[PDB]
Amino acid sequence: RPNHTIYINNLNEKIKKDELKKSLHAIFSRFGQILDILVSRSLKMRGQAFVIFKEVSSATNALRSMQGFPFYDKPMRIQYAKTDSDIIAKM
Amino acid sequence: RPNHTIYINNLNEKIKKDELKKSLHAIFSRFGQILDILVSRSLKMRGQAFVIFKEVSSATNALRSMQGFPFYDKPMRIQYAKTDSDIIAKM
RNA sequence: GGGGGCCACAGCAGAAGCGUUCACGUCGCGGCCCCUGUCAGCCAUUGCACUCCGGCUGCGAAUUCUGCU
RNA sequence: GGGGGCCACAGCAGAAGCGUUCACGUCGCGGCCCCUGUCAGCCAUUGCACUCCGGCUGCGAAUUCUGCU
Ligand SMILES: [K+]
Ligand SMILES: [K+]
Ligand SMILES: [K+]
Secondary structure, eight states, X not given: OOOSEEEEESOOTTSOHHHHHHHXXXXXXXXXXXXXXXXXXXXXXXXXXXXXXXXXXXXXXXXXXXXXXBSSSSBOEEEEOSSOOHHHHTO | OOOSEEEEESOOTTSOHHHHHHHHHHHHGGGSOEEEEEOXXXXXXXXXXXXXXXXXXXXXXXXXXXXXOEETTEEOEEEEOSSXXXXXXXX
């Protein structure tokens, strides 16, 4: 069940928000245009990120190519987001 | 063998040199005048400190009173210094 | 960093030395507390969101002198 | 933050913002590459000194303009 948005967890929770978004953008921008990267460090949402790609093909390539990739010395676990991100559902 | 200088190890190695010196001074100056606090973060000397008291009785009181005291969530391990500090030997 | 409370202290002006600062100028530099943005340490969390928001603890910078009343 | 290399850049005058800053004013805010203070993540280290000094990885302060010539 592919999706425009990939769900990444098992992220290093010590990395700050602005730095985590910039590093996630640096390693995921080669798969295609990124519309947004959503990161929160609250108890519920820490260690996780949502990367919204402009095209589902980019998300599929990113999920297959970056699965288990070490990122701040922790392997990224990548799934498709279970539901459409708000911006995707509105366009 | 009460020495002017107490040797403290099992110290939190993530604490930076200036903060470690100020915090060690806050709890040990209660026991008497401190002549110097020697802290190095090199591989050999990290997690350790030398607190030099002006009088030997202060070092004995500081040792008996602060043995095992939680310090940055690690129990302080205090001994007398095996040899005199350079500044004490020259006095 | 911010906001209050005690206990000092005759006022105003000035010089220098410091503190903060890439540096310079303004500014600030008596003791003890309390509250609070950030930051750090430890604990807890493997969590599917479109969002301020887990807990505890700690850091909370810097004095001499000279005029006038 | 600093030190270098390679290109790009006409002067005067302003407005807003940003960066550095306890906060203002001065100052600074084009691109790429290399080295590096610091900082951060991971790994290793329980160590008796009077001192630069373990390894690897990452970030690398800040502007679009605006008129006149
Ligand atoms: K974790
Ligand atoms: K996160
Ligand atoms: K140390």
